[PDB]
Design an enzyme around this catalytic site. Sequence first.
Site, short mmCIF file in Angstrom:
data_model
loop_
_atom_site.label_atom_id
_atom_site.label_comp_id
_atom_site.label_asym_id
_atom_site.label_seq_id
_atom_site.Cartn_x
_atom_site.Cartn_y
_atom_site.Cartn_z
N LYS A 7 0.83 -1.20 0.00
CA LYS A 7 0.00 0.00 0.00
C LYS A 7 0.86 1.26 0.00
O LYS A 7 0.53 2.25 -0.65
CB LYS A 7 -0.93 0.01 1.22
CG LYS A 7 -1.84 1.22 1.28
CD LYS A 7 -3.27 0.86 0.92
CE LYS A 7 -3.92 0.01 1.99
NZ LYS A 7 -4.64 0.84 3.00
N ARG A 10 2.21 2.11 -3.75
CA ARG A 10 1.24 2.81 -4.59
C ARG A 10 0.70 4.04 -3.88
O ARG A 10 -0.22 4.70 -4.37
CB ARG A 10 0.09 1.87 -4.96
CG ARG A 10 0.40 0.96 -6.14
CD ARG A 10 -0.75 0.02 -6.44
NE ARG A 10 -0.48 -0.84 -7.59
CZ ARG A 10 -1.43 -1.40 -8.33
NH1 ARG A 10 -2.70 -1.20 -8.04
NH2 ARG A 10 -1.10 -2.17 -9.36
N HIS A 12 3.05 6.50 -2.01
CA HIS A 12 4.03 7.56 -2.21
C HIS A 12 5.00 7.19 -3.33
O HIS A 12 5.41 8.05 -4.12
CB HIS A 12 4.79 7.84 -0.92
CG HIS A 12 3.93 7.82 0.30
ND1 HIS A 12 3.39 8.96 0.86
CD2 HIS A 12 3.51 6.79 1.08
CE1 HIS A 12 2.68 8.63 1.93
NE2 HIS A 12 2.74 7.32 2.08
N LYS A 41 -6.63 15.45 0.41
CA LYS A 41 -5.35 15.51 1.10
C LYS A 41 -4.77 16.92 1.08
O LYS A 41 -4.73 17.58 0.04
CB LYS A 41 -4.36 14.53 0.45
CG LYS A 41 -3.36 13.93 1.43
CD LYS A 41 -4.04 12.99 2.41
CE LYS A 41 -4.64 11.78 1.70
NZ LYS A 41 -4.46 10.53 2.48
N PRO A 42 -4.32 17.40 2.25
CA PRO A 42 -3.74 18.73 2.39
C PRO A 42 -2.39 18.85 1.70
O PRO A 42 -2.07 19.88 1.09
CB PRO A 42 -3.59 18.90 3.90
CG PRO A 42 -3.49 17.51 4.43
CD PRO A 42 -4.34 16.66 3.52
N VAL A 43 -1.58 17.80 1.80
CA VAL A 43 -0.26 17.78 1.19
C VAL A 43 0.20 16.36 0.91
O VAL A 43 -0.38 15.40 1.42
CB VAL A 43 0.78 18.48 2.09
CG1 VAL A 43 2.14 18.51 1.40
CG2 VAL A 43 0.32 19.88 2.45
N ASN A 44 1.24 16.23 0.09
CA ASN A 44 1.78 14.92 -0.26
C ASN A 44 3.13 15.05 -0.95
O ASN A 44 3.57 16.16 -1.28
CB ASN A 44 0.80 14.17 -1.16
CG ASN A 44 -0.34 15.05 -1.63
OD1 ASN A 44 -0.25 15.69 -2.68
ND2 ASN A 44 -1.42 15.07 -0.86
N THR A 45 3.79 13.92 -1.17
CA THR A 45 5.09 13.91 -1.83
C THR A 45 5.39 12.55 -2.45
O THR A 45 5.72 11.60 -1.74
CB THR A 45 6.22 14.28 -0.85
OG1 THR A 45 5.89 15.48 -0.15
CG2 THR A 45 7.54 14.46 -1.58
N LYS A 66 7.98 9.85 15.54
CA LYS A 66 7.01 10.62 16.31
C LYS A 66 7.02 10.19 17.77
O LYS A 66 7.06 11.03 18.67
CB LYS A 66 5.61 10.44 15.72
CG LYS A 66 4.85 11.75 15.55
CD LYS A 66 3.70 11.60 14.57
CE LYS A 66 2.36 11.56 15.28
NZ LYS A 66 1.55 10.38 14.88
N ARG A 85 1.32 19.44 -3.19
CA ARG A 85 0.63 20.19 -2.15
C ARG A 85 -0.62 20.87 -2.70
O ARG A 85 -0.63 21.34 -3.84
CB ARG A 85 1.57 21.24 -1.55
CG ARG A 85 0.86 22.24 -0.65
CD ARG A 85 1.85 23.06 0.17
NE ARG A 85 1.26 23.56 1.41
CZ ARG A 85 1.97 23.88 2.48
NH1 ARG A 85 3.29 23.76 2.47
NH2 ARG A 85 1.36 24.33 3.57
N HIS A 119 5.24 3.78 5.49
CA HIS A 119 4.70 5.10 5.78
C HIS A 119 5.69 6.19 5.35
O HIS A 119 6.90 5.97 5.33
CB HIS A 119 4.39 5.24 7.27
CG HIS A 119 4.70 6.59 7.83
ND1 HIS A 119 3.78 7.37 8.49
CD2 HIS A 119 5.86 7.30 7.82
CE1 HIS A 119 4.35 8.50 8.87
NE2 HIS A 119 5.61 8.48 8.47
N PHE A 120 5.15 7.36 5.02
CA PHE A 120 5.98 8.48 4.59
C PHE A 120 5.82 9.67 5.53
O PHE A 120 4.70 10.03 5.91
CB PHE A 120 5.63 8.90 3.16
CG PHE A 120 6.81 9.33 2.35
CD1 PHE A 120 7.41 10.56 2.57
CD2 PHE A 120 7.33 8.51 1.37
CE1 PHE A 120 8.50 10.97 1.82
CE2 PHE A 120 8.43 8.90 0.61
CZ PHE A 120 9.01 10.14 0.85
N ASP A 121 6.93 10.28 5.92
CA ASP A 121 6.91 11.43 6.82
C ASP A 121 7.01 12.73 6.03
O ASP A 121 6.03 13.45 5.89
CB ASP A 121 8.06 11.33 7.82
CG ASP A 121 7.58 11.43 9.26
OD1 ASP A 121 7.17 12.53 9.67
OD2 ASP A 121 7.62 10.40 9.97
#
Length: 127
Positions: A7, A10, A12, A41-45, A66, A85, A119-121
């Site tokens: 997941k 597909r 990030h 989504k507010p932002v992404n990369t 975190k 973004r 996961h992406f930070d």
Amino acid sequence: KESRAKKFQRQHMDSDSSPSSSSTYCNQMMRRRNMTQGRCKPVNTFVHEPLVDVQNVCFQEKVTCKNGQGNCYKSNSSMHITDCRLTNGSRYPNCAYRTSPKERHIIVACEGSPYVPVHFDASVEDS
């Protein structure tokens, strides 16, 4: 027949596609990647680098998370990625992003077995 890490790929990891992404790539892509389903989504990369690379990171370098543990890691070096973004005050169902073609380090949280990013930070600017 589904998994977690997959997941993340597909999610990030967009290596599949090539660089030079300026068009509404993200604007839509992000939405096509089942990321704007129900909400926006507010932002992404995104990422234009091969997984095998990002994976090595978890074995190359490490960073705090975190919670405050070594659950996070940073790429031993920069990596091709596509910024994404929100823009134009876009909002669900509407979703507009600004595809920013760049290449720099990145931080992801890998776990499970084998050790892969699930996961992406956020992307980094420099070392």
